[PDB]
Amino acid sequence: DTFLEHMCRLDIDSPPITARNTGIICTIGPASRSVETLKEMIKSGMNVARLNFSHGTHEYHAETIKNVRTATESFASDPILYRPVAVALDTKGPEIRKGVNLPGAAVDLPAVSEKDIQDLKFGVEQDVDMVFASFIRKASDVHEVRKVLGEKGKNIKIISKIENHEGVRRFDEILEASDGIMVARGDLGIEIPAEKVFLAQKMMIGRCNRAGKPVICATQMLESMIKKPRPTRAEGSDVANAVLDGADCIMLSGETAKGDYPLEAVRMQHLIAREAEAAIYHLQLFEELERLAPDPTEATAVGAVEASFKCCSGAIIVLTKSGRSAHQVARYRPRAPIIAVTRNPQTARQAHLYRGIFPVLCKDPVQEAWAEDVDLRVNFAMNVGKARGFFKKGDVVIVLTGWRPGSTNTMRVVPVP
Amino acid sequence: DTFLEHMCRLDIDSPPITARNTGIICTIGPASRSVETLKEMIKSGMNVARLNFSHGTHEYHAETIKNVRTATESFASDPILYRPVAVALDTKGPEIRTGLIKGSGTAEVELKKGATLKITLDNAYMEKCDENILWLDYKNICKVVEVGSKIYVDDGLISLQVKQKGADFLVTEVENGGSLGSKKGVNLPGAAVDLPAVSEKDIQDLKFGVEQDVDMVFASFIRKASDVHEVRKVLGEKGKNIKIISKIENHEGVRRFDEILEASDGIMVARGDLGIEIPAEKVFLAQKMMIGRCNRAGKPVICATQMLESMIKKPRPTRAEGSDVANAVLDGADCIMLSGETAKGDYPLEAVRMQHLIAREAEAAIYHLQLFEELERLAPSDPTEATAVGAVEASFKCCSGAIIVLTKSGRSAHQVARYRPRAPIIAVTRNPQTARQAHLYRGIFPVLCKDPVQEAWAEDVDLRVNFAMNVGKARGFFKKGDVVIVLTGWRPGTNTMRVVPVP
Amino acid sequence: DTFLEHMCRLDIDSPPITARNTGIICTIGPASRSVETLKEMIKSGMNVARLNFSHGTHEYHAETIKNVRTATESFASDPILYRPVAVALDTKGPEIRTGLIKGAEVELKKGATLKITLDNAYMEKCDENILWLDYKNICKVVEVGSKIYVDDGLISLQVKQKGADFLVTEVENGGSLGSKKGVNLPGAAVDLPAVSEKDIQDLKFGVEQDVDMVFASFIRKASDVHEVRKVLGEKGKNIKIISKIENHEGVRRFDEILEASDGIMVARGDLGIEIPAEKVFLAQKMMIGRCNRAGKPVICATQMLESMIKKPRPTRAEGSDVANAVLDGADCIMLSGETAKGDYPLEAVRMQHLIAREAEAAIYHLQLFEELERLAPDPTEATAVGAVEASFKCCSGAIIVLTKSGRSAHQVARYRPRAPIIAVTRNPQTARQAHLYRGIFPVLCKDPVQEAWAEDVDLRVNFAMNVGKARGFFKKGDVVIVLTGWRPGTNTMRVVPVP
Amino acid sequence: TFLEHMCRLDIDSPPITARNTGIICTIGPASRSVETLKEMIKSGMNVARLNFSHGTHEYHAETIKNVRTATESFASDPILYRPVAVALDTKGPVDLPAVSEKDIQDLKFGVEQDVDMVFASFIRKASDVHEVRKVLGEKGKNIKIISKIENHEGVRRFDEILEASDGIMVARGDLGIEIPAEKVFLAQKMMIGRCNRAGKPVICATQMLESMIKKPRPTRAEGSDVANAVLDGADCIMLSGETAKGDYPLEAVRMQHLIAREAEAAIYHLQLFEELERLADPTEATAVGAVEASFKCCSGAIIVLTKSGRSAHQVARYRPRAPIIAVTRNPQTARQAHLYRGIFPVLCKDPVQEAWAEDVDLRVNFAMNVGKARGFFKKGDVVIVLTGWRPGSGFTNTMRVVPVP
Ligand SMILES: [Mg+2]
Ligand SMILES: [Mg+2]
Ligand SMILES: [Mg+2]
Missing domain, CATH: 3.40.1380.20 (Pyruvate kinase, C-terminal domain)
Structure with a gap:
């Protein structure tokens, strides 16, 4: 007791x-686009498939979604064992260009670029389940995304990504406008000092738990598994720490997107999360x-x-x-x-x-x-x-x-x- | 609330x-051995200086200890601001060691991934090690190792895999390459080995520590309570006030943790060494367990290895390292130990100052x-x-x-x-x-x-x-x-x- | 907080x-027997009507029940405002008592020596020296040093000599003695029948009258409760059995009694004669506590608002005593003579409601x-x-x-x-x-x-x-x-x- | 639990x-003798109360003298020696003055006799306490003032009376006259509770073991009433006629000890x-x-x-x-x-x-x-x-x- x-x-x-109570979100790419690989990733414990719209054409993404839904529905003949698989659209978002970061600055870039507008309505057409909104810095940013999704996309969940200092400072207003939160540790590490990021992660996760809103931890999870079949103990500890912090989901990037062991990455994620x-x-x-x-x-x-x-x-x-x-x-x-x-x-x-x-x-x-x-x-x-x-x-x-x-x-x- | x-x-x-409530322990080496540097490390927050007796002579270490005390006592005129600094002796241990790299002795060679390396037991090569042939001091290795078995050299920096076995040799493939020095630690995961609680060299090192009036001993490779008792007996009546900190480095040490903790004055958690036998998805659980039981028993627990390693080459640590140190502190660790970041790195002082920042933030x-x-x-009662x-x-x-x-x-x-x-x-x-x-x-x-x-x-x-x-x-x-x-x-x-x- | x-x-x-959360139980007698009075007592907060079978014939009590039901059902036309009223039967129980004084009151003396005989030749010839009672087994449960109380503890005696079928006691406290008065044996393990022949008849009366609960008198052990259970039989197996704890054996063996009973009644008055005064409050708190723990109803009875027999308002001591019974955790409070024969029956009910509500x-x-x-x-x-x-x-x-x-x-x-x-x-x-x-x-x-x-x-x-x-x-x-x-x-x- | x-x-x-609750005994014709006081002390009396509603100063001076002779008769052994306090209870006089002329005479007599505490009767407000305090003056600044709550106003303005007083006496018998019976127990519990929280002594008095005036044993109702006063959180219990004028003053003290010990x-x-x-x-x-x-x-x-x-x-x-x-x-x-x-x-x-x-x-x-x-x-x-x-x-x-x- x-x-x-x-x-x-x-x-x-x-x-x-x-x-294993924590959701697993896998970034789908060249290494995991095939129906056969997707089938095994689902079997290994993938809950959500993220499509990164920083690269790739809409035709390319439409096929990836098609493959995800093909792999998912191949298990539909047994409703008792059928596992639902969500589709997540991750916007490219506002960039400064080789990208530039302005630590502590209140960047005035528009919440939604012209490309983001195209991709968002594409997401509405493709009937995606949720949207990862990049570089969210204030409440008006979230509502601007909501506005683009419009009436037809009102049921699409909006997950605001916190990637800089302003997002952390104005976290309360952002959370109150969002359906959920994504903590981008990698981007956060270049915007604020590294010895303060862990504090920010615990704060944001804590407030999300208190508000009953989903929080996702992303970036720098099992990156070494891009080349290796096993992760380091530090990565296993960092992932576990995010779970113990109170995270709802954990997201994989290049490990499942372009790496050499996408299937082992999902399984290692399942193991660590279950152990934690x-x-x-x-x-x-x-x-x-x-x-x-x-x-x-x-x-x-x-x-x-x-x-x-x-x-x-x-x-x-x-x-x-x-x-x-x-x-x-x-x-x-x-x-x-x-x-x-x-x-x-x-x-x-x-x-x-x-x-x-x-x-x-x-x-x-x-x-x-x-x-x-x-x-x-x-x-x-x-x-x-x-x-x-x-x-x-x-x-x-x-x-x-x-x-x-x-x-x-x-x-x-x-x-x- | x-x-x-x-x-x-x-x-x-x-x-x-x-x-900042957690102790800072810094390994002293070529990059931090000078009086001028030691003064600055003390002002930055170093509380304990660890001496690694895996290498160096008694004469070399005596000069280090002298330099630590010289830098420490230079602040002694003002009793209000004076900060005590402890000296720690970290033993070489009973672990298997390689031989001498051919030539002067040190002397390093490059092992490349995928290459062939022959491990021999022929004493004609015990001072002639290189990229082709490697000598170690465990004569019974062929009977305890198998085809497909993995061999880790120099605290897990280098990994080999046994391809075939000879009467007095092993043919291996270099899996994880790196630079190989003389007399490095050899670990055999999942192998049954006969190793004493303390080595002959450890005995003369512990005696040296008594005559040098060291404050604590970090006992390497403790697997059971009788291992700690041996270290205790060697220190004897003369060094009965010297604290014994048992280093938990493998699975058996974790398995028999309670009896070790009871017999020890404290515990060191060597995560990097733990990660050799114990998979990544379980090490963090072992850390929280050992730290928790140490807190419950009221005995000091130190977290060591894999902390700010990137600061050997850089003036700033990664955010992962910051989170890792912080999580160790939040687990309930009493002290945090820096290794190569202060021993041989390019920024030994930035390492101490950063450790202070992270610990204070946590x-x-x-x-x-x-x-x-x-x-x-x-x-x-x-x-x-x-x-x-x-x-x-x-x-x-x-x-x-x-x-x-x-x-x-x-x-x-x-x-x-x-x-x-x-x-x-x-x-x-x-x-x-x-x-x-x-x-x-x-x-x-x-x-x-x-x-x-x-x-x-x-x-x-x-x-x-x-x-x-x-x-x-x-x-x-x-x-x-x-x-x-x-x-x-x-x-x-x-x-x-x-x-x-x-x- | x-x-x-x-x-x-x-x-x-x-x-x-x-x-008000605690139940109000009222003893119905001559002063509350009428339909007119009962209607008002119901409106004033009476939940249960107790029939004391120490007095009255079957037909007298049957008429009381009829009036209670006539009064209760007069509110039945308004289902929202209708209040259910339970009927309780309280057995007379076994009891040790003396006999007739030849002639008929005498005068006892403190420090004097009163002799106890079992010879029926003096069953109607009792006086200052010799006295008879009907418990023929009294010389097995009483011993040298035992105490004997007579008529509600108004007279106390201490056993000095043992006999073949007689006792020699010294009057510890004097007073005045009548005839056929009650006798208590503090500490003694009385072997009287769990249910007398009169109680058997009254229990069968309760079944045919369809009573809701029975207050079983003088319960000392588990087998006493089951004997009452047997008499009620198949026909009355849904009738609740509330065991009355009245002596030391009942308190000592309370657990086995509670485990065999549907509920418990704490008879403070009878308890006060059997055990010392500085312990009754402990026994009450103990028994109420274990009943709360077990989830079985517990009733506190006797010495509640006794002064309201002659007065329209109670003393502050009575108000405090009732409140503390409620605060101990009692489920119900039972009113006796102040509703049965007193001059202010419906004032006592209203006051009981006020006290309980304030508590x-x-x-x-x-x-x-x-x-x-x-x-x-x-x-x-x-x-x-x-x-x-x-x-x-x-x-x-x-x-x-x-x-x-x-x-x-x-x-x-x-x-x-x-x-x-x-x-x-x-x-x-x-x-x-x-x-x-x-x-x-x-x-x-x-x-x-x-x-x-x-x-x-x-x-x-x-x-x-x-x-x-x-x-x-x-x-x-x-x-x-x-x-x-x-x-x-x-x-x-x-x-x-x-x- | x-x-x-x-x-x-x-x-x-x-x-x-x-036994943890103090016992206060009213001393009168039945308990005045040195040898009876000795037995009451051995039986557990901690405080001797003097009721100044009757008797001359010469009568009370003799009583106080007897109390101290009995007390100091046990002084030859400091290990077993029990201190006994002397309490003065004023006769007392709603706009009646706080201290009557007789009361003023009694209060100054109390200072001269070096009493330990005073039970002030019919306190209705804080100013009544301050007036009693002023009478005792510099000489009696260390004498504890215990305000007796006897009416409805005293209960109403209880908070300010408690703040001004060193302690409180709950006069239950007098309380029962002025306020309904279905409310007195609430007032007692309230006052005792606030006294416990404030950390000031509270005494329950009147209608305790009254039946012991003529009988050697109390009723179970009295035993229950006294026990509940203790369980409410009372610091002391006070006996009156049981010890003052009754046939069994020594038995009354011994019973009060038993009840308080059982509670x-x-x-x-x-x-x-x-x-x-x-x-x-x-x-x-x-x-x-x-x-x-x-x-x-x-x-x-x-x-x-x-x-x-x-x-x-x-x-x-x-x-x-x-x-x-x-x-x-x-x-x-x-x-x-x-x-x-x-x-x-x-x-x-x-x-x-x-x-x-x-x-x-x-x-x-x-x-x-x-x-x-x-x-x-x-x-x-x-x-x-x-x-x-x-x-x-001092700390x-x-x-x-x-x-x-
Ligand atoms: Mg970005
Ligand atoms: Mg080692
Ligand atoms: Mg009876």
């Missing part, structure tokens, strides 16, 4: 028993997040997480349409996996942005009686959890639903049949 | 408003109250222990500027440090060795009182206390109107706690 | 803000729940804990529980929530029996069962929503907790706004 | 801990201290630390070397479970220390030593012997010791953990 005990009980000779999970002290996170929260859905979400610790439940099953209800549960960081059951394929993909959310896509048609339709979706989650090893028959799980059709404030404690 | 809020309130624009992320509260209910607890407890209540401890052996200041107060611990002592060894503990700011002993014990106490407050004011620990805690014994020749206001 | 802040905030110049302000609810949760050894009990936890954090006006046997509401009450528990049921018996638990506000639903389950749930929920707003537990805009099952024939918790 | 503490209560188990087992100390701590200077910091350390080490006692008694009062506020042995050379503070719960005042009559260190250990060792004799602790046990640092130090800012020799 102390964080000190938790560290003292760490045993490197025992395999990690809990699942044993050092995570869940009970303290939840109790602190509770005391820092400012509604029947909020109250039910807290109750579900609270009960998940009391019952030692194998999972928290959440029936959701937009994903919002599952997100509210994720904010409180339960140790138990959050099985988000949805019929919306987009919300299933976007759910990977939140730590601990294991999204499943229900393809069964809507049943006439509401009580029937709820039981159907729950039993679907029951089957997935059994197949994934989350829980077994006889265990207890928490289920969050709505009370009436299109009403979620209902919690029930049910045994696994 | 909460750990999460403490993180949220972190501010890279706000200047550091706290003292101090803002430390959540003190949770540490003490957990270390309280995790702690194993002793009047000194209860007084120590009470002093730390009161330091949080009164928001004390410091906890002043009057000590002779350091023991009293150590028991306070285990509970990790937010306020600095000013350990006032008349024992010079106590003042130097105190750097091993986080949060302890040792102070050497040179004033003679007053017969009136109450006058002697208030004299030492007034000295501590002058030190505290000068270092900016506290000012007039602040309150401090004072720990003393009750009679002349430690169960007394006093809450006193600063005038 | 602290219990002492709670005590410091206490304001006597401030009206009681919360609803609620000194209760530190959040402390009690956190301790009860942590000291606990099932989907329903996980949902019950979750409901109480949510009620504190939502600052809920109430916890609405759908139950048919009462069980689900009972295990919510165990964790002592601040918010009142509105137990909605169609079973009239569980509605009456629910008064035994602190904070449970039972309502009886008379609406027909809807074939669509989700519609029947909302019907009962809406009924509770109307009751709570009428009682002032909550208003529109507030948030309440709702506990239901998920299918027809309690593991579902819902957070819902008050419409 | 507090709940499990209640569950563990065993009436068959003898009270092991010492001690129901007290949940760690909750009190933790709440008192979170609802709060070198000494005040040392006081908290000593109480906290006493719980950790399971200390047999907290030894406090004090001159004015204030240091012991600071420790007493935080309600430690361990007995507070207050070692003083001042006979007055030794008698006044009984007003505070958990303080066991002891009077050192050893000559002052030249070396201040020697004089400290002398007094500490005195407490060691007193503790062993009283059964608070034994050889091998550990106690907390609070002292000043040097001669002249008890020095805490030491020391094994019992």
Whole structure:
């Protein structure tokens, strides 16, 4: 019941028993564009595929997206094991040119270049799940991106990338305007002194956890795996540290984009993230997040997480349409996996942005009686959890639903049949 | 209020408003051996000077120690600003070593990736090593190694892979190349080796350390408790006050950590050496485990290797290195050790100054109250222990500027440090060795009182206390109107706690 | 944040803000027997009517029950305002008493020597020297040095000599002695039958009269409780058995009694004769504590507002004594003679309501729940804990529980929530029996069962929503907790706004 | 937990801990004799109250003289000697004057008789206290003033009365006349609570063991009522007619001792201290630390070397479970220390030593012997010791953990 005990009980000779709760985002490039490679990367644990729009034509990116969706849908014949895979568009953004950085300067470059405008509407056409907005420095930058996406792209998640000092200084207003945050350590390291970057990372991650908004750590993760089949201990420690800081997702770059071991990189990411999970002290996170929260859905979400610790439940099953209800549960960081059951394929993909959310896509048609339709979706989650090893028959799980059709404030404690 | 809020309130624009609490240990070599440089390293924050006895003669090391003390005592005229500097002897160890590179002896050769290298056991080559043939001192290597086995030379800098085996030789391929010097360390991962706790050379080195009055010993390649006991026995009665710090370098050392920790005065975590047998996805877990158990036991723990290595060639470190050092401090490390960055680098002073910056920056992320509260209910009738607890407890209540401890052996200041107060611990002592060894503990700011002993014990106490407050004011620990805690014994020749206001 | 802040905030110049949570039990006798009086007592806050079977015939008590039910059902036309009223049967129990004085009062002397005989030739010839009683086994449970109290401890004797079937005692404290007076044997392990033949008849009377609960007198051990259980048999197996602890053996063997009982009654008066005065308060706090821990109802009875038999207002000592019983954690307070035969029956009920309601302000609810949760050894009990936890954090006006046997509401009450528990049921018996638990506000639903389950749930929920707003537990805009099952024939918790 | 503490209560188990609440006895015709006073002292009387509603100054002077003859008859053994305080209770007089003419005569007689405390009747506001304070003047500036709360206005303006007073007496019998019965218990709990938080002594009086005037045993209702007063947090309990005029004054004291001792087992100390701590200077910091350390080490006692008694009062506020042995050379503070719960005042009559260190250990060792004799602790046990640092130090800012020799 102390964080000190938790560290003292760490045993490197025992395999990690809990699942890997942090999302994996892989940059797709020449080394990982093929359908066959993408299939194995999905099998190895890739949750999100990022397309870097600093280079490449729209025709080139359209094919990459096509390949990602081909590899993803090849597993669709088994809905119990089917893993949703999101598509992320990463803008080139404003540049100064050999690129130039102006440390501490309030750069007045427009939030969205002419190329970014083209790429953003291309992202709307391609039905991407989220956008990584480069070089975000203020709230008006985020809303300018939102404006370009327009009405047709209103459901596309906007992740603001913090790449300089102004972004760190004005972090609160940026966070309040964004759907999530990406911490670009590499770029941050050239804008502020290196001995202050780790402080910035912990601050931003902390405020994202407090706000219940997804935070992504990017750059300088496993870069040595571009040439090597194994990473250094320092890289394994840095990655783990980002997980323990409270990051929702971790992003790979050249390791999966152009490297010689893209598949080994994804697997090494999965291993490190799963190993770091044993050092995570869940009970303290939840109790602190509770005391820092400012509604029947909020109250039910807290109750579900609270009960998940009391019952030692194998999972928290959440029936959701937009994903919002599952997100509210994720904010409180339960140790138990959050099985988000949805019929919306987009919300299933976007759910990977939140730590601990294991999204499943229900393809069964809507049943006439509401009580029937709820039981159907729950039993679907029951089957997935059994197949994934989350829980077994006889265990207890928490289920969050709505009370009436299109009403979620209902919690029930049910045994696994 | 909460750990999460403490993180949220972190501010890279706000200047550091706290003292740097973690000790800085610098390896002394050709680039930092001079008196002029040593003075500047002390002013920059060096607390302990490590002497690596893997190379160099006793004569060479004696001059280094002399130069350290010359630079140290040049500040001794002002007792208020004087900072004690400890001397550490790092043993060569019982690890397998290569032979002499042919020629003068040193003499280095270039091993290139993909090339063939023949490892021999024929003593005709024990002083004739090069890129083609390599001699090592483990005669039984062919029986303990296999085809496909990997061999690491010079602390993991160079890696080889065995291709085929002979009666008295091995044919290998150079996997990770580099420059090879004479008598370098050889590591055989996953191999069963017969190695003594301490070598014949280590024995004469430990004796040399006693005659040179060193403060601590870094014992290399400790795998079990009996390894520490041997080092203890060699030091014997004459060196019974010399602290023994066990270096954990392999899997067995981690596996048998508890018995080693119990037998040792402290622990060094050699991450780079750990990474030889232990994969990248597990090393960080071993670090947090060993540091945690060291904190729980109240014994010093040092993080070593792979810290600011890029500063050997550059004046600035990478952000990854900054995060790595910081995470070590946040894990709960008492000290951070620099190796080649101060030993042979081009910027030994920038290395010390940067280490000071990073350690001071990381101090803002430390959540003190949770540490003490957990270390309280995790702690194993002793009047000194209860007084120590009470002093730390009161330091949080009164928001004390410091906890002043009057000590002779350091023991009293150590028991306070285990509970990790937010306020600095000013350990006032008349024992010079106590003042130097105190750097091993986080949060302890040792102070050497040179004033003679007053017969009136109450006058002697208030004299030492007034000295501590002058030190505290000068270092900016506290000012007039602040309150401090004072720990003393009750009679002349430690169960007394006093809450006193600063005038 | 602290219990002492709670005590410091206490304001006597401030009206009681919360609803009365403890049950009020009133002994119905000559002064409260009429329908007119009963109606007023019900409106004044009476939850349970106790019938003391020490006095009165079956037909006398049967008429009292009839009047209680006539009074109770006169409010049945308004289902929202209707209050269930339970009926309690209190057995006479076994008892050791003397005999007739030849002639009939005498005068005892302090320090003198009164002889105890068992010869029936003096069963009607008792006086200053010789005296007889009916416990023929008294010379096995009493020994040299034992104490013998006579007539409510008004006369104390100390055993000096043992005999074949006689005792020689010295009058420790004098007084005056009548005939057929009660005898107590402090410390002794009495072997009287668990249930006398009269109690057997009265228990069978309770079954055929459909009483809700029985207060079993003079319970010393687990087998005593099961003997009462046997008499009630199959027909009365749903009747709650509340064991009355009245002597030292009952206190010593309290655990086995509680483990065999549905509830406990603390009889302070009888306790005061059996054990020293400086220990009764400890026993009361102990027994109430273990009952709170076990989640079983506990009733404090005797010596409550006794002065109100002759006066319209109680003393400050009585007001303090009742309040402290409530603050100890008692579920119900029982009124005796001041409602049964006194001159101010409905004043005593109203005053009991006032005292209990004022005592609620000194209760530190959040402390009690956190301790009860942590000291606990099932989907329903996980949902019950979750409901109480949510009620504190939502600052809920109430916890609405759908139950048919009462069980689900009972295990919510165990964790002592601040918010009142509105137990909605169609079973009239569980509605009456629910008064035994602190904070449970039972309502009886008379609406027909809807074939669509989700519609029947909302019907009962809406009924509770109307009751709570009428009682002032909550208003529109507030948030309440709702506990239901998920299918027809309690593991579902819902957070819902008050419409 | 507090709940499990209640569950563990065993009436068959003898009270092991010492009695911590002071006992104040009203002295009258039934208890005036020296030999009866001797027995009351041995039975646990800490304070003798003189009711100046009746009797002449010559009558009360004889009573005070008898109280001191009985007290000093035990003086030949400083180890077992128990200090006994003398209390003057004014007759008293809503715009009636604070001090009547008779009261003024009685208050100045009290100064002349060197009483330790005064129970001021019918206090309704802070100005009433200031008037009593002014009467006692410079000569009686060290005499503790205990304001008696007897009416509704006194309860209303309680905060300002508490601030001006040295202590509070809850006159429950008189309270019951002016305010409804379903509110008196709330007022008592409120006043006791605020007194505990402020760290000032609170006394519950009237309607205690009244039935013991004519009977040797109290009713269970009285036993329960007295016990709950203790459990509310009262520092002292006061007997009236039971000791003043009753047939069993000695039995009344012994019963009050038993009840208070039995109620001690129901007290949940760690909750009190933790709440008192979170609802709060070198000494005040040392006081908290000593109480906290006493719980950790399971200390047999907290030894406090004090001159004015204030240091012991600071420790007493935080309600430690361990007995507070207050070692003083001042006979007055030794008698006044009984007003505070958990303080066991002891009077050192050893000559002052030249070396201040020697004089400290002398007094500490005195407490060691007193503790062993009283059964608070034994050889091998550990106690907390609070002292000043040097001669002249008013601050008890020095805490030491020391094994019992
Ligand atoms: Mg960029
Ligand atoms: Mg090595
Ligand atoms: Mg009876």
